[PDB]
Design a protein around this ligand. Structure first.
Ligand code: 7BQ
Ligand code: 7DB
Ligand code: 7DB
Ligand code: 7DB
Ligand code: 7DB
Lengths: 103, 103, 103, 103, 103
């Protein structure tokens, strides 16, 4: 298996690593139907989403999507600094695949 | 997908944005049958609910309804400031569709 | 829908509001079979339970029962003050239907 | 229903009450197959388990077993004092049936 | 059942104990498909994973794998010191079977 977020992100088409080194500026959460998603921003001006579950996802991703949203909320609430994100850049806003945090 | 709560809120009939910019004043949670709901209030005087799950909800909202109740509880307990709420205004109290918070 | 815990509680037979205005004194949790329950006490002397799930509970209550127990544990550990409880008084200890907290 | 952990514990065969009045000393958690369990210890020298789910458990205990482990982890991480444990003493280490804590 | 992490770790082939005695340096979490996993590092330079659920796992492990990832996240955010890890050493990074923490 991969040993770092970069190694992992490189295993996928249409991804890139963003170097964030910052806490989340804003957290947005929706339970509106067809828009069950989370959006985060940073003071850098970047916006990212956890996508609505959809037919591009495989069954093993369902719990992982929910875990990612849980991680983003508690990261936000604790002002925990994020190191890097692995995103898919064929979505607007870019779509989160992985997160790393360092202390 | 949308990039802000206001953009997302505009994709729905019977909504409006409330700019709260405050912590939650009170949190009420019920497990009584047919009233399995959360109610929050603000010192502004506004009251909002997460509705009981019903026939208007689609299957993709079931986990999101539970997540939103989770977010309101921890928001209340940590005195985290809410920025905006997207609410459905065809319910009393108005019904939460989305939340945003910024720091 | 109701806008306060008192309005809500008044929708049911065999209920009453306790105005506690205090943190939980003790928290007890059991996973013993047929006693899968939580019991809380207050220094004023009151003792309340979240009942074991049973045939009096409708399906929509199953998640809500689990949520209430979640809520009681984190309220206890954070020494958060409970304002009101709505309880059923046809069970001993009286059984929690809803809780409110204000800050 | 019972009003105290000791009343509850007395309904069961093969149990006893340990009065600990202390934080947990160590927390061990395993996801190794057939050993999906938590082990806690205390400075007084006692070791206790939450048992692996098994054919001795009834279905209502499955969510309760998971809750108990949730509770032991957060209790460990917060240094929260445990007051009493009701344990089954026909297992080695003795097996947790209920827990209480007071503030 | 076992009473220590070491005793438990010895009930499996392809395992060893690492004595960490340290908090987690980095936390990495992925929802990318077929890489739904968590990776941790320490300032020692070791790296460990919770593996993607796979056909080597038995059904009783599915909730435990999710629990272990929950534990690692909160352990990381709280700066909690880990005492030992039991890991499978036939994977790269080595794969977490059990964790212990003492205070
Ligand atoms: C406490 C206990 O019950 N311990 C036993 C342990 C568990 O039953 C088992 O690990 C749970 O699945 O199974 C042990 C163990 O050492 O892991 N075990 C497992 C095995 C099966 C063996 N392989 C198969 O079943 C595939 C196979 C199919 C057909 C024919 C031949 C091979 C096996 O090693 N299973 C565990 C594999 C490990 O899974 C781990 C996660 O659970 C990690 O991912 C490891 O990296 C991986 O090697 N045999 N013995 C024997 C231990 O004494
Ligand atoms: C580690 C690993 O397994 N990585 C592999 C990766 C995963 O297997 C896959 O993403 C898991 O679902 O699958 C890779 C990938 O880069 O994502 N992949 C996937 C695909 C095709 C595949 N397209 C289809 O299955 C539609 C299709 C159906 C029938 C016939 C033809 C097309 C595809 O790109 N799937 C991922 C789509 C991405 O999903 C993401 C969420 O998981 C995001 O939403 C992205 O914005 C979206 O592009 N091509 N390469 C190749 C890569 O090696
Ligand atoms: C982003 C997106 O997909 N937005 C679309 C939105 C969603 O598809 C829909 O809300 C998702 O369920 O559906 C829109 C909308 O504005 O909500 N839509 C939907 C409808 C009719 C549709 N009527 C039915 O589902 C029948 C029905 C009514 C009541 C009970 C049981 C069954 C309807 O308004 N659905 C939403 C109802 C609202 O649900 C909300 C919870 O999700 C709140 O409870 C509201 O108070 C309630 O009005 N008209 N417009 C159009 C909008 O474009
Ligand atoms: C054709 C038709 O519509 N028939 C319906 C029937 C009639 O409307 C009713 O019988 C007319 O009086 O009403 C039915 C019925 O089963 O009688 N009905 C009745 C109820 C009220 C419903 N009865 C049950 O949930 C079943 C039950 C109660 C107690 C012990 C064990 C099981 C009721 O009052 N539940 C609340 C009971 C309270 O539950 C609380 C937890 O939620 C606390 O534990 C309280 O301590 C407890 O008193 N809900 N549905 C449903 C049935 O479908
Ligand atoms: C006519 C009659 O009532 N016969 C019944 C019989 C008697 O009630 C019993 O022998 C009288 O003492 O008790 C029977 C028996 O076979 O002896 N019995 C006894 C038990 C053990 C019994 N099981 C149940 O009560 C659940 C259950 C109910 C109904 C059917 C099956 C399971 C029991 O001792 N459960 C607790 C075991 C403890 O579980 C704990 C966790 O929950 C810990 O792990 C403890 O270490 C463990 O000892 N299971 N079946 C079933 C039998 O049908």
């Amino acid at each position: 298996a991969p040993q770092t977020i970069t190694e992992l992100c490189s295993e996928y088409h249409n991804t890139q690593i963003y170097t964030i080194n910052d806490k989340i500026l804003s957290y947005t959460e929706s339970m509106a139907g067809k828009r069950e998603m989370v959006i985060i921003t940073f003071k850098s001006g970047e916006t990212f989403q956890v996508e609505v579950p959809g037919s591009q996802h495989i069954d093993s991703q369902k719990k992982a999507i929910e875990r990612m949203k849980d991680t983003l909320r508690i990261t936000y609430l604790t002002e925990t600094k994020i190191d890097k994100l692995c995103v898919w850049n064929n979505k607007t806003p870019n779509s989160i695949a992985a997160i790393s945090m360092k202390n």
